[PDB]
Design a protein around this ligand. Structure first.
Ligand SMILES: *[C@H](N)C1(NC(=O)[C@H](CC2(C)CCCC2)N/C(C)=N/S(=O)(=O)c2ccccc2)CCS(=O)(=O)CC1
Length: 218
């Protein structure tokens, strides 16, 4: 049995909403967001981790292209391989590609492994969000309705399972029956519901939200 609703923000495991700007670092923000929750669960400290660190260092060897896109899974592997990731405070976000400047003296977190959930299974995603923590996912955000979203449960008839935008599921619930996934975006606090968007849940893997989910562990 799983809870009917979950919101990790209530558990102090979600940091402030970030603004990626003109740099396509959605994947980096999604990855750090997922790890930030695990760091809190392990150490009791809520610390924003360096998305810039991923943009600058989890590059070609990880199939990533910095401000031109990347993967949350390979970002997690970089953190594992690198034996650490710096704090956002020590390695701030500049919304541009930079030479890798990682330094272990600024290490704020580590990662031991990551898990990729089975394709399109919203029930498995629900269990992971309830029992493991926030989960990194990809969604189809190639529709004007996504950019124009303001509030309520988002549903786009033209959505597909071809995802292109990396975000973070930090909970789930229902708005007057309409089930949804609580998503933390990285487009600033002025987007949607102050940085978040509630997306249709149990509506046939709407916008591919359950297509490629993954979460790290410490
Ligand atoms: C993010 N700001 C940006 N998208 C990505 O970086 C994108 C995120 C995904 C779709 C990767 C897997 C989950 C989230 N990364 C990549 C590499 N996408 S892809 O088109 O090569 C892809 C691979 C596998 C499955 C689906 C798609 C927004 C869109 S962008 O401006 O084109 C690049 C940055």
């Amino acid at each position: 049995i799983l809870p009917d609703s979950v919101d990790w923000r209530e558990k102090g495991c979600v940091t402030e909403v970030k603004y990626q700007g003109s740099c396509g670092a959605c994947w980096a923000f999604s990855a750090v967001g997922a790890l930030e929750a695990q760091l809190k669960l392990k150490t009791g400290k809520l610390v924003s981790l360096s998305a810039q660190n991923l943009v600058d260092c989890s590059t070609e060897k990880y199939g990533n292209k910095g401000c031109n896109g990347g993967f949350m899974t390979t970002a997690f592997q970089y953190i594992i391989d690198n034996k650490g990731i710096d704090s956002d405070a020590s390695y701030p976000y500049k919304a541009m590609d930079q030479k890798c400047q990682y330094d272990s003296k600024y290490r704020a977190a580590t990662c031991s492994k990551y898990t990729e959930l089975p394709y399109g299974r919203e029930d498995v995603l629900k269990e992971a969000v309830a029992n493991k923590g926030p989960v990194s996912v990809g969604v189809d955000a190639r529709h004007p309705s996504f950019f124009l979203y303001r509030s309520g449960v988002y549903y786009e008839p033209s959505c597909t399972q071809n995802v292109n935008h990396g975000v973070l599921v930090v909970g789930y619930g229902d708005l007057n029956g309409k089930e949804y996934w609580l998503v933390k975006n990285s487009w600033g606090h002025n987007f949607g519901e102050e940085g978040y968007i509630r997306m249709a849940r149990n509506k046939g893997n709407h916008c591919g939200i359950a297509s490629f989910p993954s979460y790290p562990e410490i």
